[PDB]
Design an enzyme around this catalytic site. Sequence first.
Site: not given
Ligand code: IOZ
Ligand code: MG
Ligand code: ZN
Length: 313
Positions: A68, A72, A106-107, A217, A269
């Site tokens: 952030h 970004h 925005h951040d 974003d 992911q």
């Molecule tokens: C690419 C991107 N851009 C923006 C944002 C906000 N995010 N947030 C993620 C994490 C998503 C995510 N990862 C998990 N895991 C749990 C086990 C290991 C990882 N869960 C449950 N959810 N990736 C991104």
């Molecule tokens: Mg933000």
């Molecule tokens: Zn952002």
Amino acid sequence: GLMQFTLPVRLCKEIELFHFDIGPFENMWPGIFVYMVHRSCGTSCFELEKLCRFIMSVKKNYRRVPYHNWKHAVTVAHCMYAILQNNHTLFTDLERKGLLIACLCHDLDHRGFSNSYLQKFDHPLAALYSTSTMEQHHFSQTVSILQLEGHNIFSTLSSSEYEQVLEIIRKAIIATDLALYFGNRKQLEEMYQTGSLNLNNQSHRDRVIGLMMTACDLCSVTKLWPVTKLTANDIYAEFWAEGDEMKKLGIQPIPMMDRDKKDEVPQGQLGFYNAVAIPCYTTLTQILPPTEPLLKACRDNLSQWEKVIRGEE
Ligand SMILES: Cc1ncc(C)n2nc(CCc3nc(N4CCCC4)n(C)n3)nc12
Ligand SMILES: [Mg+2]
Ligand SMILES: [Zn+2]
């Protein structure tokens, strides 16, 4: 007044594409941003001296966190630039002005922690702003910088134009709260499907700008695979630090923030592309057909994460 900003040929061509990477040369990002405002808005939208001084005060108020950060901010503004240029005639002179500023801001002053960590830590910002805690702070930091001497890039605007642009920026920055994204996309989905979506309805525009802001974003998911992959390292490096802090308060962090669940990143992911990214660019493509490359690139990166899980990388 006769002073164009130009970029080397490769950047001049590739900057117009959704998947452009702003590169590792920090000192070229301010110039890249001014290039984008001039082409998106006009060379006459902002007094150059004030704009340059606003950009450098904004840069100074982003912190050295893994994700952030100032990089970004400029990445998110570039995505907005591509959306605005591929949808020329759909947006007002004020929106074009406000939305690139909104994305850069925005951040502002992000600390690398979620709204949830501020609330469980009991950070003063969680007492001042009960919901969208960081995002109200980001808008508040934007207004502060606008009010520094020599920083009012909106000085030429009328009293009521000025109020309208600050209101566009405020809603734009609030909408980067991913907690609000889900309901906002669902509403836009149904309005588009029943045919009620009307871009003269100011409350409808708001939602649409809201979705554009989520799209911009999340735009790390719309890049070349190696950009996408290396940004995920930065994203997790913040989340895992937050997970450590959660554990320091004696709380088991969610899996997303637990560095002990590294091995499950690929599957995390997948969930994220399916639950958030794909739906976001799907609904955006429906409302703004010329943004389809964001959806297409998001699908390609989903497929690259599938490949990681299957052992094919
Ligand atoms: C690419 C991107 N851009 C923006 C944002 C906000 N995010 N947030 C993620 C994490 C998503 C995510 N990862 C998990 N895991 C749990 C086990 C290991 C990882 N869960 C449950 N959810 N990736 C991104
Ligand atoms: Mg933000
Ligand atoms: Zn952002």
